[PDB]
Subunit: 394 residues, 5 copies
């Protein structure tokens, strides 16, 4: 009976259009905060953050007060959308096609006029997602909230610290924090300033998944490329090993292509690693052609230059620790024996060329191994967060 009586009394002459202050000249203080429940998605290609949040707004309605003695037991009332004045706070940097994903719930008012409003929502927000250091990256995505049509002279927006006590951890992203800042900005539309409250979600990517699924795979497959410098040339499979690894790594680059944005602010760390690896595998194919060209050198073609004979067979090789009818019969048998001698000297020349190929193959093995290690270590450890990622995730 008292709840029915109070609801009838409170809506007498109430105008939801009217900002509920007693003195029309002063601004209404609105306290704004949020409660972050979940980070649902970090879409790097579209540059969008999806979160489950509960907005928190609280203010004082001058007209919605009563004396609890005259209504025993009725400490609070509730009003749905449209029957009560509410602040029109929107997320400025919204990426949602409706632009406002807020699910409108009740406003809870107590007997002194304090109004609480806690609409939930699945919010899509635009934030610059920097992939320069991917996958060892930290993202800072802003959520900028503010009254759309009330400037600082009418609505005095005030900030309170974000609530994370209900945050559900994300298996991919490690929540570092969510600080907030209250600013007052001027826009070209209007002489009046408009205040905003901006919360910056700082998140660290967890690198175990990409380490075991992207980085390590690539390292191992690059190592197989260097295996060509150990395969004997007579196997006749040197070129198949190298080009096969190359074809495999090309598909791998395109696999990373599906997850990275097509921006030009910087060459990402992962792009550099794949680049460096690809030229190394490609260069090994070039070297293999050179090695095969020696191993198959015609013994009756040009003559091994002195510069080759010295650099390879001596220096590099040492450094690598390698190292009447009787007369007619005599003319026929002598021709046979002489023919055997000529091929023997010819094949000796071929042995030198084959040995040169082996030396070049051993030389490039050492050089490519060093270069692969240096490029890999250098690129990965360039990231500021690489040491932290190893400690926390591995």
């Amino acid at each position: 009976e008292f709840q029915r009586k109070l609801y009838k009394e409170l809506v007498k002459n109430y105008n939801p259009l009217e900002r509920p202050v007693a003195n029309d000249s002063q601004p209404l203080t609105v306290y704004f905060s949020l409660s972050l429940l979940q980070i649902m998605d970090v879409d790097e290609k579209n540059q969008v953050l999806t979160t489950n949040i509960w907005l928190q707004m609280s203010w004082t309605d001058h007209y919605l007060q009563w004396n609890v003695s005259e209504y025993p037991g009725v400490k609070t009332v509730r009003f749905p959308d449209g029957q009560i004045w509410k602040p029109d706070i929107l997320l400025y940097n919204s990426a949602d096609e409706r632009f406002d994903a807020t699910f409108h719930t009740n406003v809870l008012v107590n007997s002194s006029g304090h109004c609480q409003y806690l609409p939930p929502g699945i919010f899509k927000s635009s934030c610059y997602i920097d992939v320069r250091w991917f996958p060892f990256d930290v993202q800072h995505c802003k959520l900028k909230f503010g009254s759309w049509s009330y400037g600082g002279w009418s609505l005095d927006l005030q900030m309170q610290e974000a609530d994370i006590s209900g945050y559900i951890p994300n298996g991919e992203w490690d929540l570092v924090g969510i600080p907030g800042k209250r600013s007052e900005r001027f826009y070209e539309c209007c002489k009046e300033p408009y205040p905003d409250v901006t919360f910056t979600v700082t998140m660290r990517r967890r690198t175990l998944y990409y380490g075991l699924n992207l980085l390590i795979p690539c390292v191992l497959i690059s190592a197989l490329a260097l295996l060509v410098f150990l395969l004997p040339a007579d196997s006749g499979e040197k070129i198949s090993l190298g080009i096969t690894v190359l074809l495999s790594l090309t598909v791998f680059m395109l696999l990373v292509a599906e997850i990275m944005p097509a921006t030009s602010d910087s060459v990402p760390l992962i792009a550099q690693y794949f680049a460096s690896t690809m030229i190394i595998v490609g260069l090994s194919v070039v070297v293999t052609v050179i090695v095969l060209q020696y191993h198959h050198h015609d013994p009756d073609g040009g003559k091994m230059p002195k510069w080759t004979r010295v650099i390879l067979l001596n220096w590099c090789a040492w450094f690598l620790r390698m190292k009447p009818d009787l007369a007619k019969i005599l003319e026929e048998v002598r021709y046979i024996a002489n023919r055997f001698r000529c091929q023997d000297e010819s094949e000796a020349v071929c042995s030198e060329w084959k040995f040169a190929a082996c030396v070049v193959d051993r030389l490039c093995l050492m050089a490519f191994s060093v270069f692969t290690i240096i490029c890999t270590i250098g690129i990965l450890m360039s990231a500021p967060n690489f040491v932290e990622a190893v400690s926390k995730d591995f």
Copy 2:
């Protein structure tokens, strides 16, 4: 005439804003339950569960009572959304972009004021989907329901057991159960506690599909890799077999990549199996290079070390059960015969090196076969539910 009369009488002074109790100081008891019709989707990558459910709410409306003698034949009435007070129960962990997928239906009230409300819905809910043991996994996805704006002092939410009599089986997921728990929790917003009813859908994945399409394929293709240790070196195809298997298995890992979340809570079982298999195939390629390096060893290069001569040709080989013008003519023919003898001894040296390659090839065949079996069996049987899956699905 009586139905028209009763509808006119019941809405006289009715206020949908008003919680329908007689004594404003006491809370209204709302009985909440659900009826699970279908598990529509388990999205492991986005971590979302889609279900077809019928919510069940029932309470007592103090104002919607009548005397059936005064309205003969009118035992029940119905009211749509907005003409009657309803509890504002939402799914807290909703992943739906509207945040509330409930389809609003009628409230059915009988002559004593008992109100029933059974809205259907396609619900999207957020739940941690653990892929540690995939595909032998059991998921526990929670659905947390509660009044949004009425605390424990006004709405007394009470739980009833979930209904599954209409459940339609899912070909992928075996419904284990759906127990419920009623809790009362405090939030930072409000001093008043808020009760919730949470139902935990426990589901077991059916492994036949992934066994025949993911696990067995991989096992067979790994076995082909070990086939290299039986292929003679003179075939000149040892490296093509191995690297081809490797390229195939790389695509297979990326196929599993499209279905798994990118989380770092644990290395999944399937990831370990693919890892172990990949290094085994990759290591077999390394061994093949060593085997070919012996088979193609130059007979005029270094000399077979004693350590090699003993470990391989004796121990390993036993264990494996392998095992004036006349004078001028004499000088020419003697050179020819001597030349033949020199190559003969040379090719004998080559035979030892070729035999060493065969022994190493046989040795690694046994070692790799053992390792492949142990790694496969060990990884699969680590899962707690592996034995159950085999019994129920195979």
Copy 3:
């Protein structure tokens, strides 16, 4: 003037909440049917059917009658949603996120109160799609309609045969029929029974597309695998042909993976066909290694077992219809001649081993050809609808 007068008269005291019967104690008869215009989609992976349907409901409104003499020319009126009582019939097994895809249109009433209501819709429904016999499958998808909040005591739902006179043929699915059944079921919610009308869309898949794009391709590529048993061993390409076919067929399995659900109710027909084919190609690779192992057998290694010498060179081969200074000179020339004789006998031994490989290769060619035909024919003709599909589609 009369149309305006009649609309004013009919809405006097009309209450859309009120079931429009004269006697409140008796149920209102609602005739329900549907008109199927198109089968838009059969999603086997998500297990959802999309159709374009026109629902048909008809009943009698006791209050919406008039005397056409008093309103000359006004034979009918129309009312939109909310101004007239309507049955609240929903599709129970809806897969749509709004749960109700009905587009609300007018209710057409004639001068005796007969009301017709024919809302169109794009309906998404859940149905078990059995892929056991895919692509030779017949699907039975149910559409279950019923009043949500009116039980059998108030709304007497009655069925009429579905209309297909406007059905537009689907190029993929051959509509077999759409019979309907009216049932009355009890639910745990309520003591009152609720009637439903269920229409079962029975559709036959047209197999021409999958025959020419999925089945025949696979058959031809498997045949190329058997081609290895005709390729001479000295070509040095036996292993490349086989493993290449294997890599190709693995991609083909994953292509079928994108269209099939991940259920475990049964191993599909297409899965069995790919399985059988894959082991046959894989087994041919194993046999190729054995054949090469003979063709490259060292003549100075073990000795051809008697069991081999008899089974192959005799039985299998027949069945297959294969089949002072002068003395010093004498010692040098005799050594040369003797050396030639030793290699000659050695290469004769090699010829036997090479012939054994040829016999084994011919033997397995016949065996694999038989097995490929039997497995292919057996699997395809296991389907109950295989004969029908060939007759109608090919």
Copy 4:
């Protein structure tokens, strides 16, 4: 003042439910047309057409007239949805999930009651998309509009020619025309006939994109297959070239698979072209095995049949324009010389077999080249629109 006065006067007793005619017995004439702005999408796989259209409806409202002398300057008024009677014209063959994509705009009425209504929309419509001649195809997609609840006795729908003056050309589709037809049809629901206006969008596909990206690529890669019949057998790469082309073309078929519907009304032109090409490449692999089988024929095996010796070495080859101690020493040297003679005759036999392989290789080169040209030209020129496509697009 006059605009305010007129709006107050016109809505006095206006009933949006009432069809605005003076004589209730006669039908209201509604003129229907459309303005086609853009063809947005032609989805062949889902069989849906997406367009940007402006509907045009015009009729006479008997009640919304005024005397412009009594309201100087007020020549027109406007009414939004729900305040004015409108025809309920829908697109019958809609594929949109809401079923009605019309964006509701104002109705513009002049002082004599003529009402204009031009709602814009993004319309999704179902049309049979025939891919028999793809990519040289012409599509005829219908858009069928009609009043949903007003039959021919109440609403007299009349057609006017479609407007294309604002049409924006589509880079893929060449708009041929959009004629319209007005029909009157009977439905099983109702004895009254219902008129419809149907516009048929006829569009020609532009073939430059598919010619350079789909047809020509395939032609060139098939040509490489025939290159095998020029590669010498001793290269040992004949089988790798052929099977590699085959693997490439299999992926290409699956690429076309992603864009074509899975219907069985006909085998498309593109499917036939890929079919023909695939068997040609596959058959070339079979021939390569035969050629290699001759080139590697054992000289001590069977004897070259007479039928082979004549058909190939003579006919085909001509047509192709190819073409005491002294005695002991004598026995040893005679054995050596005799041994040399035996191999010489043996290798002569091998030369004939190698030449036969060359002849067969040359023969099949000519045959396969002819067949490839004929099949390609025949298939492409079977399309009725092939000549037109070349003239307009190339």
Copy 5:
């Protein structure tokens, strides 16, 4: 008290249907502009631009004025959708399925009747996206705004310069400008003209991402194809290198296929580059077959033509800087010696053919290298914006 009083006074007799002018004969001036916050997406395949914009409309409402002395402190009021007259300005070339993505916010009115309205939105617009010069392209996408139902005689639309002070840079697109133009156009619907304001977003694509991920990769992989002309023929791997590169580049074309529209207005720059490269790699395979055909030429077949002997061994080779019992014994040994001589001359003939292959291989290396450079440089530098892209992005 004054805010409540003013809201009550202003809505007395207010009619939102009425255009708020004092003199009904004159048009109402509406100032239109926009504020561009973000370019969210440029979808080249669907030809759609997605942006985050704030529309700006301002006009004068003759009825919403008051004297601020009579309402101290009340300088402004606000009205939501439907309680105030607003211009019905839509985006004409909308690609959104609702056709109007505007989020409706408040209208802010001051004491002299000046009304401001700044609705935000995520706008999808249709624009021709020219890919002729992709990835060095500049796009000009139009956004055409205008009143839908008010012509130039009633609503006088006037333009103001677009605001970009809040523009957030896009990592892919460099905003060049957003000029606007106000036009007045006649349509077939209506004799009255309708004015529009069109803003043209001009954007330059940033080429770093595609340069490092699309252009450079392709250049390097084409270079590997030319590596075949350095690989010795005896390696037996010439054909595997070439066809492998070809298979890789085919996948690369299909990767670009997923991002380009299927239009026929022009052959894109990227298509030409891939075309040119593909024929070069394919032609190198053809040349390799010719080179191998010489290297494996039978010495007893045809005779090297004079035209070949001169062009290659002399001209091209110079330009390239290449270059009683005793008698019986005599007959046996003489046969042996003569046999050795015959093979010697035979292998000399083979050496010439092998050298010819080497010369042809060297010749084509130079020719293909030149052609690859010219085609690459020519195609890339054909783009008008190529020089600008290098300067700004590299």
